[PDB]
């Protein structure tokens, strides 16, 4: 009943676009120690993705300004320290999530499906830290992201249908990590092409509940392939 | 100096869509006690309107959910509403106090006096959207600000000036939503549009885009309120 209230508040926060409140509610649900339902973990990930997402978006705007103000010493320094302040919020949010994942989510995940969900998330938030790390710190963070994604990739390959949104979403993100973080466009294309083609091969495995998410993520996989070829 | 870089920072927060940082920068500028320039007061206006705007938006959503659910899910929505109202009131109070203490006293030109009285009118009006009493006192404070704003601008500014037009736009809305007088809202809006249309030669290259945008909004409201 308490947890059910926290969840109702999270949905309320979501509708009012108050993502800090939504994330605070779902983190409390998480810290009660029980395995999250599908809806709860979906809410937890929506909330935190919006919270970290605002910093990432801010970080890219500020970086672009810091580069394009190369000749103006004062303007460019102000940008560097604004960027650094954003990076600090960003790392704190990433650490908050990664810590929830290690302490509650991953070790208690009793289904392949939720193990893959939480490991994807781990691969994701280390990816977000790798986006703003340097330079020897960056190396171990890149490694943490790749291991989480690699384990999730292996479980999903073994336990989940190719058309499952979580399995597709992991392929999508893991392909993005190769392209963006390890500068490996060909590995990225290979990963995404395989996930796309394997889903195309097994289109009878979509259910009425899954398909809209699956087909969206397939389209995204092929959008990236298109982009990354030309 | 300090001021010049708080402003540059404000501009950087804005491009990053970090409006709490933008407002906090522009609040510090204001608190230094010197008259704001046009750019500075526009940045102050944009920062706080975004900060308060997020609360009003959230408020309309939650309050609507609450009104649609009759009997204890209702309670939850109500207490969330009230928490949002408090944020919103704190923000408006913060602004109204900057207006009274720093901005309205130092305004040396009609243009900028009208600007601040329009702001004062707007922030009292946001307090009004969310008041119940108490409310009568708040509405009156909004009305008196917009009225003085409206008198000064009629005497000192061209009908196409963006500030004068925007004041007419918000005062109009105040009549409509707050005082529940559709006819007076339409008459304020109609006169402001028609007077600008008759004097389009008074548009500057610097101003015309703002002016014509508010003209469109004035008419759009008039359309909505009659049709």
């Amino acid at each position: 009943m308490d947890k059910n209230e926290l969840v109702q508040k999270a949905k309320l926060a979501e509708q009012a676009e108050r993502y800090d409140d939504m994330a605070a509610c779902m983190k409390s649900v998480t810290e009660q120690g029980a395995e999250l339902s599908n809806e709860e973990r979906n809410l937890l990930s929506v909330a935190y993705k919006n919270v970290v997402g605002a910093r990432r978006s801010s970080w890219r705007v500020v970086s672009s300004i810091e580069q394009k103000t190369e000749g103006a010493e004062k303007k460019q320094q102000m940008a560097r320290e604004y960027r650094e302040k954003i990076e600090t919020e960003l790392r704190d949010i990433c650490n908050d999530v990664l810590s929830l994942l290690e302490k509650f989510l991953i070790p208690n995940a009793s289904q392949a499906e939720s193990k893959v969900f939480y490991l994807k998330m781990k691969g994701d938030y280390y990816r977000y830290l790798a986006e703003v790390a340097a330079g020897d710190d960056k190396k171990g963070i890149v490694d943490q992201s790749q291991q989480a994604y690699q384990e999730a990739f292996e479980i999903s390959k073994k336990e989940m249908q190719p058309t499952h949104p979580i399995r597709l979403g992991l392929a999508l993100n893991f392909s993005v990590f190769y392209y963006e973080i390890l500068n490996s466009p060909e590995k990225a294309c290979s990963l995404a092409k395989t996930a796309f083609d394997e889903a195309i091969a097994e289109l009878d495995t979509l259910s009425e509940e899954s398909y809209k998410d699956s087909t969206l993520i397939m389209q995204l996989l092929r959008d990236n392939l298109t982009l990354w070829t030309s | 100096m300090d001021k010049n870089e708080l402003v540059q920072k404000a501009k950087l927060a804005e491009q990053a869509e970090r409006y709490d940082d933008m407002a906090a920068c522009m609040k510090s500028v204001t608190e230094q006690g010197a008259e704001l320039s046009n750019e500075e007061r526009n940045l102050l206006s944009v920062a706080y309107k975004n900060v308060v705007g997020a609360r009003r938006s959230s408020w309309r959503v939650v309050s609507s959910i609450e009104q649609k659910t009759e009997e204890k899910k209702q309670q939850m929505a109500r207490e969330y509403r009230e928490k949002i109202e408090t944020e919103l009131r704190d923000i408006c109070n913060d602004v109204l106090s900057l207006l009274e203490k720093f901005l309205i006293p130092n305004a040396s030109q009609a243009e900028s006096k009208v600007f601040y009285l329009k702001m004062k009118g707007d922030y009292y009006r946001y307090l009004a959207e969310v008041a119940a009493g108490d409310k009568k006192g708040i509405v009156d404070q909004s009305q008196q600000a917009y009225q003085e704003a409206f008198e000064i601008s009629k005497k000192e500014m061209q009908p196409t000036h963006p500030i004068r037009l925007g004041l007419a736009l918000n005062f109009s809305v105040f009549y409509y939503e707050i005082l529940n007088s559709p006819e007076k809202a339409c008459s304020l809006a109609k006169t402001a549009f028609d007077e600008a249309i008759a004097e389009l030669d008074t548009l500057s290259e610097e101003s015309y885009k703002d002016s014509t945008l508010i003209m469109q909004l004035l008419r759009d409201n008039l359309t909505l309120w009659t049709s």
Binding site: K49, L227 | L169, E177, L217
Partner: peptide
């Protein structure tokens, strides 16, 4: 519906509703 005065390719990962 009534207006007051207004305010004013890269890789795709999994979106957020």
């Amino acid at each position: 519906h009534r207006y007051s005065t207004p305010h004013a390719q890269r890789s795709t990962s999994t979106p957020n509703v």
